[PDB]
Design a protein around this motif. Structure first.
Motif, PDB file in Angstrom:
ATOM      1  N   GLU B 159       7.260  -0.995  -5.477  1.00  0.00           N
ATOM      2  CA  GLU B 159       6.603  -2.005  -5.270  1.00  0.00           C
ATOM      3  C   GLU B 159       6.504  -3.043  -6.428  1.00  0.00           C
ATOM      4  OE1 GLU B 159       4.635  -2.123  -2.504  1.00  0.00           O
ATOM      5  OE2 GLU B 159       3.360  -4.030  -3.384  1.00  0.00           O
ATOM      6  N   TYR B 281       2.118   1.958   1.975  1.00  0.00           N
ATOM      7  CA  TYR B 281       1.379   0.816   0.808  1.00  0.00           C
ATOM      8  C   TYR B 281       1.994  -0.389   1.328  1.00  0.00           C
ATOM      9  CZ  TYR B 281      -0.452  -0.535  -3.730  1.00  0.00           C
ATOM     10  OH  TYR B 281      -1.394  -1.293  -4.529  1.00  0.00           O
ATOM     11  N   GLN B 282       3.249  -0.747   1.840  1.00  0.00           N
ATOM     12  CA  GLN B 282       3.850  -1.901   2.375  1.00  0.00           C
ATOM     13  C   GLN B 282       3.426  -2.155   3.645  1.00  0.00           C
ATOM     14  OE1 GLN B 282       8.141  -2.175   2.095  1.00  0.00           O
ATOM     15  NE2 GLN B 282       7.985  -4.365   1.414  1.00  0.00           N
TER      16      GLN B 282
HETATM   17 MG   LIG Z   1       2.249  -4.751  -0.671  1.00  0.00          MG
END
Ligand SMILES: [Mg+2]
Lengths: 340, 338
Positions: B159, B281-282
């Protein structure tokens, strides 16, 4: 009237059989009721309510919009010009079961100007219904819409794919797509996985393909740096030409997906704007809409056009504005009466 | 001869002369006899039978160097000596939480006893993990207490981390309009208010710095970053990032646990947890929808297929996707999975 009835020429692959100019009647094979009267060398399409030996019956008017509609690009059409009153109709046949493209070409000849400008113009469809046009320009504009798989002007407008003739890199190093993004031209033509030969194979002119040497196969860092140090601007003409080749190429993938679904019609039977909406979302999210846009594809295969608008309004994918603009195209086709 | 046997402190929620040896059976257990000497609990084990000592315990197969115990489990931490079917260990933590144990083992009064004996963990299932030294056990504890590995998560390979207000898009791109002012490791304020952050536990001093950045998206966020950027300290940016990373991890945890697989999320090794959270999360937390091939392999416990699933996603983010796969592979190679 009909004025200039034996003027100009007629596009017809059917040319039937002491050069005699007595009237000859024939039934055009693949169909009924398509009686034709040939006087001089020319096919004449006549209709009447009153039953007869040599006239067709009155044809039903198509529901297709003359101002905004299209005919399927996969269909041959018949183009006629003439006059009609009180259950009698007499039309010179100008194009007899010819392709859309053939028709467009044929209708732009100075030879046919007199006849097309001084009579009512109509298209007789393969389904034997007719579209009556207010004027020849409207007819010509209908054919132009019809021959395109998507509306390239909407596609390259800012609300959709946009248009930038200068080599551009539509990502940044903080972006997640940085490394997969390549040098881009026109309306999303990305060269990151394309060579010069690829573009030639796809029918891009050599003069254009040569210009792009140095921009091919560059991705991520190299595409980014290349654009910043040595950009390249195509002319609008070349950039549109290059963009449309890829738009149309992509469109055929969506088309096949739609056609394979066997939902009771083909992609070419959908109105232009709706085809443009479906292609737009595909071009951006990937063409296999069954996976990349399930809620849209559901409404499509169900032919639930109101539901299709709702679906577009209802996905939040970080691109909701573009999705709302796509649903607005479908909603236009609904409001215009093109869908349902 | 446990140096400093009666030194320091013992953390235990369970419990005049005490100079007499008192013996007990630790309540909710079995083969967990304790011996209190001078007020301190002693765990003894003997090979040849006795009725004051426990039977010898089996060694856990959990890796002492790279493994974890579930953060939902209580642990017993012991330090002592052993040889020839005779084991004698002073209990330092008796069925404490991981976090409790970390704090307790880092007190100065215990430094001496932990430095000079063999340190081990007696697990809830009564199996034991033997540690080469206290530093190792402490690191094992730090891995176990975290739902994901924050340093990997925030590394450039995943991230990433940028304490400066940034806008990770541009006007051309698909996502220009949905993108907001971002801080640390992907904390986006576009649909968040100062109150939301306070509700999520973000301290007022940090929350206060972000006042003009909340709820901005698209053009407004993009301009704001250009015209009035703010750089947070690394510590404050990590604090903020870690709150949202952990919050997101609990979302994924819940989905995993709701699948009834049947092991809990807390039972997966750290790196595999990190991998799953990182893709969520992505791409969106609902992994059964946002990354089905990955999710289908997870819930089938097909760890090798999990790696391949990661390796074969084509979403335009191949590099990171393969790095996540590589985390799982490391756990397989370490013998942590299967
Ligand atoms: Mg993101």
């Amino acid at each position: 009237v009909p004025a200039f009835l034996f003027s100009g020429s007629t596009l017809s692959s059917y040319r039937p059989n002491i050069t005699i100019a007595l009237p000859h009647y024939v039934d055009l094979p693949g169909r009924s009721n398509f009686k034709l009267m040939y006087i001089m060398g020319f096919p004449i399409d006549t209709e009447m309510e009153k039953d007869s030996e040599y006239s067709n019956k009155i044809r039903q008017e198509s529901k297709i919009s003359k101002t905004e509609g299209t005919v399927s690009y996969e269909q041959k059409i018949t183009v006629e010009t003439g006059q009609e009153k009180d259950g009698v109709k007499v039309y010179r046949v100008m194009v007899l079961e010819g392709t859309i493209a053939e028709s467009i070409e044929h209708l732009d000849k100075k030879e046919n100007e007199d006849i097309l400008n001084n009579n009512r113009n109509r298209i007789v469809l393969a389904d034997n219904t007719v579209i009556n046009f207010d004027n020849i320009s409207q007819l010509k504009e209908f054919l132009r819409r019809s021959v395109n798989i998507v509306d390239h002007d909407i596609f390259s407008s800012n609300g959709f794919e946009g248009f930038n003739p200068t080599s551009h890199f539509p990502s940044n190093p903080s972006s997640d797509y940085f490394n997969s993004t390549g040098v881009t031209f026109g309306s999303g033509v990305d060269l990151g996985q394309r060579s010069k030969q690829d573009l030639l194979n796809d029918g891009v002119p050599q003069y254009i393909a040569d210009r792009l040497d140095g921009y091919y196969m560059l991705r991520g860092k190299e595409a980014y740096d290349k654009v910043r140090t040595a950009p390249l601007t195509l002319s609008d003409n070349e950039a549109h030409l290059l963009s449309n080749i890829y738009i149309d190429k992509f469109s055929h993938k969506i088309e096949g997906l739609f056609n394979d679904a066997n939902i009771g019609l083909r992609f070419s039977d959908l109105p232009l704007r709706t085809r443009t909406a479906l292609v737009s979302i595909g071009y951006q999210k990937g063409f296999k809409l069954s996976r990349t846009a399930p809620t849209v594809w559901n409404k499509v295969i169900a032919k639930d056009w109101n539901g299709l608008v709702n679906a577009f309004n209802n996905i939040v994918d970080g691109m909701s504005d573009r999705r709302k603009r796509e649903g607005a195209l479908v909603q236009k086709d609904i409001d215009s009466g093109l869908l349902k």
